[PDB]
UniProtKB/Swiss-Prot annotation:
Involved in the breakdown of mucin-type O-linked glycans. Specifically removes the T-antigen disaccharide (Gal-beta-1,3-GalNAc-alpha) from extracellular host glycoproteins. Representative of a broadly important class of virulence factors. This is Endo-alpha-N-acetylgalactosaminidase. The chain holds residues 317 to 1426 of 1767 of the full protein. It catalyses: a 3-O-[beta-D-galactosyl-(1->3)-N-acetyl-alpha-D-galactosaminyl]-L-threonyl-[protein] + H2O = beta-D-galactosyl-(1->3)-N-acetyl-D-galactosamine + L-threonyl-[protein]; a 3-O-[beta-D-galactosyl-(1->3)-N-acetyl-alpha-D-galactosaminyl]-L-seryl-[protein] + H2O = beta-D-galactosyl-(1->3)-N-acetyl-D-galactosamine + L-seryl-[protein]. It is an enzyme of class 3 (hydrolase). The hydrolysis reaction catalyzed by SpGH101 proceeds with retention of the anomeric configuration.
Length: 1106
């Protein structure tokens, strides 16, 4: 390429003025808000050196009519009249340029559109809107190839671990052309660096073209090439289908430049100095301050009406983690906080799940969690909904160009995507407001799932900023699913934080420039996941690694959760307590993974600092990618080694909420992924102190040991993959008030003792034991007389109807019971040997081997008693008992909660009399049934369906069957046809068909096809050696009927006491009647619904005999 030339600059017709602070002077054109040049400490950076007195309004070129006024020494103002009759533009905008110390601020302070526009109302011609304002062509700052050290550095979005989003371009003549959008951009000489911020929500496309709030352009002027950074175009008045968006969607255009000399004392001026200075002018995502202290993120899941994780139970998990981490901060995403759980009832944000304890228990959870530094978030959806939801309406649904529905997720029900632009234009904001009104204060984050994938249409930068602003206005922090989503406002990205998702192309933001700037403000980065290579092969700053134990994707591994916190997250979060100050790359390495051999340039040393001038230096141990030392670092704090390779001994000076600790509470954490002794130099304020070591378990600080300090050093030779904490004085573990608000002490057997129970019988026969998943449970075995454990149920309301259950897995034939005595009445329920395996994937005691009870299985099922308090609640007792037997019964999770069912002879309490289930007041699950093994351990596709006429009922969009038969609720199974397996069954603890007694079982049902589902009678444990079943295939209910059909069956209890009834998915093919895809799922061909179950003990007389 040959040396380039362009027009020189003739400014004979230009009048300049100057504005200046004490440190920065800007030469500005009086004709147009353009900075020609900046001066700071005798050094200069050009701005826009060639006049370009045009703007683009609604993508039309306009020569503005400008009047100028210098307001004060630092500030000038321009009134800019905009007229283009042919394109219906008639407007004016006021712009101010203002110097603030070493910053230049560009603000559009006022916009007047002379066309009549009313936010929220119809507009007959959208071209009358003033929708976009572009000052492209006027660089806010630049650098010339004639200047020494001229360079440009910019970041674009990349989520591919192999591909950096950053460009580093020497500004030379000649050079390659440049006309490209960027998220962050810096120009620098060897004397000055500048960074540019804009609130522009411009996009030039997806991927690396998105979030492009800046545009960099090469311009040749005389004999020099300039690279300038421009703000990308801004948005203003916008509409959807002629309906103008609300006023809050309009944000006045703003951009800033900051100019700096050396800012990290390395005696070089480059983009890193610009990036440090940039933190003073940049947007900061709301709630970012919290991020550095949220060390323990995880999901607590509810799903399908099951109430796997009641709000008050999550508080006990928080307490376990508080103990085990010695008071690290936590963030629990409640996936299923609403409606019947996860993926139920979307859009009705205020519909807080009733079966998990409703708004009352959610408020208690939020309030009580504060002292443990545990922040709650909720999973919501702004992209699709289901007929059941209050907000399902034809008007909100997304339709394809051909008129068909844009079908969304199908799982419990078939959802339809919504049109998010329509939604914004029609009151979306009020749904968030309703949630805030109901829930009140203290919720931390809203996690918006899906958004960013286009299901609901445009989910790009502008639309996401609007959505985030609605959420932030309620006081909530914004979080999203995708690595590329919400770059401007998000503080957490599930696909960045869960390293296992999506593979190497779908992870966090692969940009050193971006991470340098924002590492401390969000979990949005590339974490350590060696099999993805590139940036993910041992990032020096770590990167959040999220695991779970409360049911998300069937995750139950508590111990693995805690070890992962210490293996990845403690040091990740430690670094977020500082800001990056220096970043040094090494030489390129060659890697091979994921089907490619590629070059990657790794970071070798990163320095960070805090406001107290602490200095942290993180160094990769080798640049050799085939050496084990490539995946090792040293970390020093003010020169003192706190990590080397597999081990760290790290100070931690912040409480769970991030507040500075008192001197006597300052501590150090030790963790080593390998066996072996390590030696550490203590800091001066520890070196002459006594030092105590504690092993951290789910019981808190254990195995106190005073350490020997020699020559101001300690040596630690402790268990691998095990957290320890050190203090300078003896520490104890606090009272945890286990299960507060749940009416019983320690419902999950987490407190390491049974002393709060009154035990009747031989106490040696009752012990707390660990399941195969390390879940603590009460075990009773080997007892020759009854053993009982009793507590008072405390804090109950007088004259109130309640349910209580205990999870029970009984391996003995002996009677295992739950008994409530209210002071005025006693009720009891029992099980002999359990006969139904647990198939609820989000439930901690499902039958997956790694959270099995014992012998690789789990038969846990909730065993209920229903009772009513009298006038006095000072002596209500709960007793768990086990009659004589050799084998074990396991109990866990005692939940006592208000419930208004009337199942027993039309009365609430456990008692005699006809059994009826109208599904209108179910405590949880699908009682008296429990989900069967049709889908194995699954987020089971059977749940309680909720009525929303007409959408859930026959006739809407051709629906063949009602989701709900009578009242507001039925028992629905979605599409589980042709499976040859049991969908659900009664179990004797829920309903016992007594030996030799005969019952009439009646229910009403919908079935979308003939003989796809069958009513079945079984006994004992079902085996799919397949079990004998009495089989009654059921006809469809709509081809020859306008409503649900009634079915009636006689069932005699087997002498073994283990008879049950259920619904079975046959081997027959269903019939979708020529429909396919979403229509076929929606319309219910493959569905089964039950309601109005009745089971009545009868004596066979007269014609019953036939
Ligand atoms: C990975 C993730 O968050 N995916 C979302 C889906 O989540 C799935 O939800 C179903 C139940 O509906 C089940 O629990 C799966 O295990 C879980 O991965 C789902 O919420 C959809 C809804 O459109 O969004 C994501 O794909
Ligand atoms: Ca520097
Ligand atoms: Ca437990
Ligand atoms: Ca009903
Ligand atoms: Mn439903």
């Amino acid at each position: 390429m040959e040396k380039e030339t362009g027009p020189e600059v003739d400014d004979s017709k230009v009048t300049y003025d100057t504005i200046q602070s004490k440190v920065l002077k800007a030469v500005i054109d009086q004709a147009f808000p353009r900075v020609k040049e900046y001066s700071l400490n005798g050094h200069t950076l050009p701005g826009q050196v060639q006049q370009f007195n045009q703007v683009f309004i609604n993508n039309h070129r306009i020569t503005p009519e400008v009047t100028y006024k210098k307001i004060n020494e630092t500030t000038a103002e321009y009134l800019m009249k905009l007229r283009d009759d042919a394109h219906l533009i008639n407007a004016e905008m006021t712009v101010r340029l203002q110097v603030v110390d070493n910053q230049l601020h560009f603000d559009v302070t006022k916009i007047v559109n002379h066309n009549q526009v009313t936010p929220g109302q119809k507009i007959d011609d959208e071209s009358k809107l003033l929708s976009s304002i572009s000052f492209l062509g006027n660089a806010l700052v630049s650098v010339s190839s004639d200047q020494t050290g001229a360079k440009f550095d910019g970041a674009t979005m990349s989520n591919n671990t192999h591909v950096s989003g950053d460009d580093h371009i020497d500004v030379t003549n000649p050079m390659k052309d440049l006309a490209k959008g960027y998220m962050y951009g810096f120009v620098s000489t060897d004397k000055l660096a500048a960074g540019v911020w804009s609130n522009s929500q411009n996009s030039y496309g997806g991927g690396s073209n998105d979030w492009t709030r800046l545009t960099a352009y090469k311009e040749t002027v005389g004999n020099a090439n300039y690279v300038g950074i421009h703000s990308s175009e801004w948005q203003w008045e916008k509409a959807y289908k002629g309906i103008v968006f609300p006023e809050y969607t309009k944000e006045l255009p703003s951009a800033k430049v900051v100019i700096t000399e050396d800012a990290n004392a390395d005696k070089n001026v480059d983009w890193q100095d610009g990036a440090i200075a940039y933190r003073s002018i940049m947007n900061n995502p709301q709630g970012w301050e919290k991020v550095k202290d949220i060390t323990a993120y995880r999901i607590a899941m509810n799903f399908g009406s099951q109430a796997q994780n009641p709000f008050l139970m999550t508080l006990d998990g928080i307490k376990k983690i508080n103990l085990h981490t010695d008071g690290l901060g936590q963030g629990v995403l409640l996936k299923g906080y609403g409606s019947e759980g996860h993926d139920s009832g979307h859009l009705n944000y205020a519909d807080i799940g009733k079966r998990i304890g409703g708004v009352e228990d959610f408020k208690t959870l939020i309030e009580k969690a504060k002292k443990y530094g545990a922040h709650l978030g909720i999973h919501v959806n702004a992209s699709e909904t289901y007929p059941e939801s209050k907000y399902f309406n034809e008007k909100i649904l997304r339709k394809n160009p051909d008129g068909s529905y844009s079908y969304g997720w199908n799982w419990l029900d078939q959802g339809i995507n919504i049109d998010a632009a329509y939604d914004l234009a029609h009151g979306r904001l009020a749904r968030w407001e309703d949630l805030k009104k109901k829930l009140g204060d203290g919720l931390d984050f809203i996690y918006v799932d899906v958004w960013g994938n286009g299901q609901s249409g445009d989910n790009g930068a502008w639309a996401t900023h609007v959505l985030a602003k609605e959420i932030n206005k309620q006081g909530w922090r914004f979080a999203i699913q995708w690595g590329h989503g919400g770059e401007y406002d998000s503080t957490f990205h599930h696909w960045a934080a869960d390293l296992t998702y999506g593979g190497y192309t779908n992870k966090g933001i692969n940009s050193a420039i971006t991470r340098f700037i924002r590492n401390h403000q969000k979990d949005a980065w590339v974490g350590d996941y060696r099999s993805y290579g590139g940036a993910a092969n041992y990032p020096l700053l770590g990167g959040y690694s999220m695991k779970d134990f409360e049911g998300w994707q069937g995750r139950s591994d508590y111990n693995g959760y805690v070890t992962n916190l210490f293996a990845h997250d403690v040091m990740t979060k430690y670094f977020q307590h500082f800001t990056v100050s220096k970043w040094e790359n090494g030489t390129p390495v060659t890697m091979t993974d994921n089907g490619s051999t590629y070059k990657w340039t790794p970071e070798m040393r990163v320095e960070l600092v805090d406001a107290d001038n602490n200095k942290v230096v993180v160094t990769r141990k080798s640049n050799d990618v085939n050496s084990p030392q490539y995946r090792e670092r040293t970390v020093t704090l003010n020169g003192r080694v706190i990590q080397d390779g597999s081990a760290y001994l790290t100070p931690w000076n912040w409480d769970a909420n991030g507040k500075k600790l008192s001197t006597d509470k300052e501590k150090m954490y030790y963790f080593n992924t390998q066996a072996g002794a390590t030696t550490w130099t203590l800091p001066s304020d520890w070196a002459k102190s006594k030092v105590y070591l504690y092993k951290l378990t789910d019981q808190g600080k254990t195995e106190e040991q005073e350490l020997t300090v020699k020559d101001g050093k300690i040596t630690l030779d402790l268990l691998a993959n095990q957290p320890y904490v050190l203090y300078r004085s003896k520490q104890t573990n606090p009272e945890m008030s286990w299960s507060e608000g749940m009416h019983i002490y320690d419902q999950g057997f987490n407190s390491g003792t049974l002393k709060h129970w009154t035990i009747s019988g031989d106490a040696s026969k009752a012990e707390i034991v660990k399941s195969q998943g390390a879940n603590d449970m009460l075990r009773i075995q080997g007892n020759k007389e009854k053993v009982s454990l009793t507590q008072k149920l405390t804090g109950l309301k007088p004259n109130t109807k309640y349910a209580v259950y205990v999870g029970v897995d009984n391996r003995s034939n002996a009677k295992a019971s739950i008994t409530v005595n209210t002071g005025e009445k006693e009720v009891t329920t029992y099980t002999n040997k359990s006969l139904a395996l647990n198939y609820v994937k989000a439930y901690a005691h499902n039958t997956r081997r790694n959270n099995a009870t014992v012998d690789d299985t789990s038969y846990f099922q909730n065993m209920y008693a229903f009772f009513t308090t009298g006038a006095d609640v000072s002596n209500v007792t709960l007793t768990l008992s086990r009659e004589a037997g050799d084998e074990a019964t396991y109990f866990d999770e005692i939940r006592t909660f208000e419930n208004n069912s009337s199942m027993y002879g039309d009365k609430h309490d456990t008692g005699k009399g006809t059994f009826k289930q109208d599904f209108e007041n179910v405590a949880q699950g699908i009682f008296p049934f429990v989900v069967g093994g049709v889908e194995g351990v699954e987020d089971n596709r059977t749940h309680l369906s909720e009525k929303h006429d007409p959408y859930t009922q026959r006739g809407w969009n051709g629906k063949k069957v009602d989701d709900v038969i009578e009242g507001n609720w039925s028992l629905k199974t979605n599409g589980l046809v042709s499976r040859r397996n049991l969908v659900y069954q009664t179990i004797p603890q829920n309903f016992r068909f007594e030996a030799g007694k005969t019952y009439r079982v009646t229910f009403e049902y919908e079935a979308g096809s003939d003989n796809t589902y069958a009513f079945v009678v079984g006994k004992g444990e079902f085996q799919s050696q397949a079990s004998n079943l009495e089989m009654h295939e059921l006809p469809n209910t709509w081809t020859d009927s306008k409503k649900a059909k009634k079915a009636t069956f006689l069932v005699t209890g087997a002498e073994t006491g283990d008879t049950w009834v259920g619904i079975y998915s046959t081997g027959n093919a269903s019939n979708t009647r020529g429909d396919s895809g979403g229509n076929a799922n929606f319309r219910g061909y493959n569905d089964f619904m039950m309601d109005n179950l009745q089971i009545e003990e009868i004596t066979l007389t007269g014609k019953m005999l036939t």
